[PDB]
A paper describes a structure:
Mammalian cells show different susceptibilities to retrovirus infection. N-terminal β-hairpin and a core bundle of six α-helices. at positions 82, 92–94, 110, 114 and 117, can change the tropism of MLV.
tryptophan substitution at amino acid position 10 in CA. of the CA-NtD of this variant at 2.0Å resolution. RMSD of 0.6Å across equivalent Cα atoms. of the channel the aliphatic L10 side-chain forms the base. L10 in the base of the groove is shown in red. hairpin together with R112 and T107 from the α5–6 loop. residues 8 and 10 in the β-hairpin. forms part of the rhTRIM5α binding site. defined Fv1 binding pocket must be extended to include this region. observation that huTRIM5α restricted the L10W mutant virus.
Residue numbers in the entry: 1 to 135
Amino acid sequence: PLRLGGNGQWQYWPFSSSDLYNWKNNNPSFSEDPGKLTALIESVLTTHQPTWDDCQQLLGTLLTGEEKQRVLLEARKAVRGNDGRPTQLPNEVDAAFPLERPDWDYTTQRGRNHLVLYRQLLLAGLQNAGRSLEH
């Protein structure tokens, strides 16, 4: 999580393990009921402003390896180019939705801007994977 500090600086705080444990174990699996975990994750992305690593941890905890892989792959399918339309250009896809830890600096606006886009894409990916599972 990212939090605006009392000194005007953005601070990184890791998820608490009790929160992670509870989110997973108080909830049905993603495959069994995609809507419940999707809603949970959407709220977490909003309220906790997680970093790229937080998102990996959140997905890793709540999803199985197969679920998580589908979700990230769907997220990358959601990347758009300048024309406001889909792109499959590796450099554009990787730039918006990196699968490897990026160099994004949470203390900077550029870095928080990348994070906002990444979380929007992740949510789309989650929604879209959920729908496939639902039909």
